[PDB]
């Protein structure tokens, strides 16, 4: 029981850790999407010079 209940609580703690990590990653991804805009612009220009002959 006691070990089992402890394990269940540990599983909940792991879920909290995992739930939080995903949220942090999502926030980071949003910032990146906001960030490195020049790549976007220049990145856009990117294909253009090589797409055609």
């Amino acid at each position: 029981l006691e070990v089992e209940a402890k394990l269940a609580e540990g599983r909940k703690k792991i879920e909290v850790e995992l739930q939080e990590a995903l949220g942090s990653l999502e926030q980071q991804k949003e910032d990146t999407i906001k960030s490195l805009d020049s790549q976007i612009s220049a990145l856009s220009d990117d294909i253009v010079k090589k797409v055609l002959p």
Partner: protein, 61 residues
Amino acid sequence: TIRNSEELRGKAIEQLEKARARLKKVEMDADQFRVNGYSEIEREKMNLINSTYKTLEQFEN
């Protein structure tokens, strides 16, 4: 008649004493069994927690 009662009493006491000696021994086996079981239960509990912590970490992965 005399040789009978004595034998009964001899055999009888050999047997009550023997039975109670066996009780003691068992009292010993059980005593042993209880300790082993307790240790096994603790290890098993340890098993569960450890492995579930592993499962957590894999979930995090």
